[PDB]
Amino acid sequence: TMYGEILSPNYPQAYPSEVEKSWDIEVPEGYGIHLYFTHLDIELSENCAYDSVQIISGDTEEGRLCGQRSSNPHSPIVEEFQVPYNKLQVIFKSDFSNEERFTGFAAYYVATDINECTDFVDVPCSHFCNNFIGGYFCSCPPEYFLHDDMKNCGVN
Amino acid sequence: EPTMYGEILSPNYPQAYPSEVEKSWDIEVPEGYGIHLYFTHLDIELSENCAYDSVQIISEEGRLCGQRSSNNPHSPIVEEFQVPYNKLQVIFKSDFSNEERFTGFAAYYVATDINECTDVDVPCSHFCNNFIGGYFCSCPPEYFLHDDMKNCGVN
Ligand SMILES: [Ca+2]
Ligand SMILES: [Ca+2]
Ligand SMILES: [Mg+2]
Ligand SMILES: [Mg+2]
Numbered sequence: 001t002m003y004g005e006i007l008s009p010n011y012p013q014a015y016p017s018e019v020e021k022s023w024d025i026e027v028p029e030g031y032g033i034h035l036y037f038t039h040l041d042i043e044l045s046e047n048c049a050y051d052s053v054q055i056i057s058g059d060t061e062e063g064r065l066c067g068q069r070s071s072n073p074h075s076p077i078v079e080e081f082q083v084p085y086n087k088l089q090v091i092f093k094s095d096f097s098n099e100e101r102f103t104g105f106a107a108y109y110v111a112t113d114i115n116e117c118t119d120f121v122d123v124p125c126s127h128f129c130n131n132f133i134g135g136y137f138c139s140c141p142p143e144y145f146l147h148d149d150m151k152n153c154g155v156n
Numbered sequence: 157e158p159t160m161y162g163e164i165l166s167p168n169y170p171q172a173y174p175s176e177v178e179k180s181w182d183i184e185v186p187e188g189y190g191i192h193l194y195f196t197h198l199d200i201e202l203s204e205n206c207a208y209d210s211v212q213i214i215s216e217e218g219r220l221c222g223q224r225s226s227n228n229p230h231s232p233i234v235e236e237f238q239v240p241y242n243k244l245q246v247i248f249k250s251d252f253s254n255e256e257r258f259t260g261f262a263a264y265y266v267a268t269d270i271n272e273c274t275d276v277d278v279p280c281s282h283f284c285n286n287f288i289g290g291y292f293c294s295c296p297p298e299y300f301l302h303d304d305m306k307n308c309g310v311n
Contacts, residue, residue, distance in 0.1 A: 003287040005294075012297035031288075038283070039297055076283055076296070103297065110287040123230045128196065132161040132266040133189075133288060139163070142170035142197055142262065 001027060002111045008053070008092050008104025012039070015051075015104040017097045025088045027111035030134040033088055036080040039106040042066045043098070050095040053105050057083055068102075084114065126152040158186040158242070160267045166211075166248055166260025170197075173209075173260040175253045183244040185267035188289040191244050194236035197262035199223045201254070208252070211261055213237055214245040223258070240270060281307040 006023050008015050027033055035055060043051040048066035055063040062081055069078045090107070116136035117129035125138035140146050140153035147154055164181050166173050185191055193213065198220060201209040206221035213219070217237050226232035237244075246263070272291040273284035280293035295301050295308035302309050 002289060003285070003292065038294070106297065108285055108294065110285070113288065117230065125230060127230065128232060129230045130161070130264055130266065133269065134160065137161065139196070139262075139264065142259065 002031075004109050006090055006107045006109070008106070011104045011106055013103060014098055014101040015092075015094050017094055019092075019094045021092045023090045025090065025109055027086045027109075028134065029086055030114055031086055031111040032082065032084045032114055033086065033109050034080065034082050034112050035088060035090075035107060035109040036077045037065070037105055037107045038076040038078065039103070040065060040078050041068050041103040042105065043100065043102050044068070050093075051098075051102065052093050053107075054091040054093075055081055056089040056091065057085055057087075062088070065105075082112070084119070086111075124151060158184045160185060160189075162265050164246055164261075164263045164265070166262075167250075169260050169262060171259060172254055172257040173248075173250050175250060177248075177250045179248045181246045183246065183265050185242045185265075186289065187242055188270055188272075189242055189267035190238065190240045190270050191242065191265050192236065192238050192268050193244060193246070193263060193265040194233045195220065195261055195263045196226070196232045196234070197260070198225070198234050199259040200261065201256065201258055209250050209254075209258070210248075211263075212247045212249070214247065215239050215241055215243070217244070220261075238268065240275065242267075279306060 009021055044067040048064050052064055052066045065079055071078050113133045115131045116124055117131045123129050128139040130137050130139055138151050144153040144155050167177055167179050200221045202222040206219045210219050210221045220235055224234045226234050269288045271286045272279055273286045283294040285292050285294055293306050299308040299310055
């Protein structure tokens, strides 16, 4: 998708006790993901060991959140992540009884274009790199032609 | 028809353009996008206010002529335009004889996302969320989005 919404179970009301829920997010190849939380109302615990919302990018934990926090008066964002990959996983955990009636979280994500020409160490073209939304293409100086590898330019 | 990018080359490029010719190109990207048009090669007759040979960009966004180049190795841009519309017209004109054998131009265009949230008839009652190609509205907790997809309410 190019965008989506992720809401904790029962949101905007108190989340269920003793539950674990997972969501997988995927955008097209050629894009990264901007994930932003607009509501965070989770029981606070040391190192968020009990209730929590985790953001995973592989086997790698990108973030782990708990507690209550609000926003910047002109933006509802309370926490956000920008990742260079097109897949991400979010996991929500509620441990024991939710007696204080915490309401969970709300997050949104949007696909972001990867700039293949500038985001990395080397330019993927011998000569001119042209970034566009979803991909990129190489081009050449006048009187040059692009080889079949769609990367290198040559002359006859 | 609508494309996300493209190339525009003067007639006979990369060799000398013909004498006495006029050519036009219609650029179109999808709704929800603007256009970034950039020139990587400019070798046209020089005249004041480009009254003779010229490349005109119309939505007049600009008019170019003369000869100029860039030493930027991977992103040569001698002239560029960014328009918030999804259609543009480019017109190349060559008048009289091209005795100096000028070689014209090379340009590329790419669609750019329009951020509907920041550009000023607010499209959402509460929160606007921009994304590539569109935008969506959202609501504060305990408020629901009406079926019109723009206004939030409560029961
Ligand atoms: Ca790209
Ligand atoms: Ca948009
Ligand atoms: Mg708990
Ligand atoms: Mg002339």
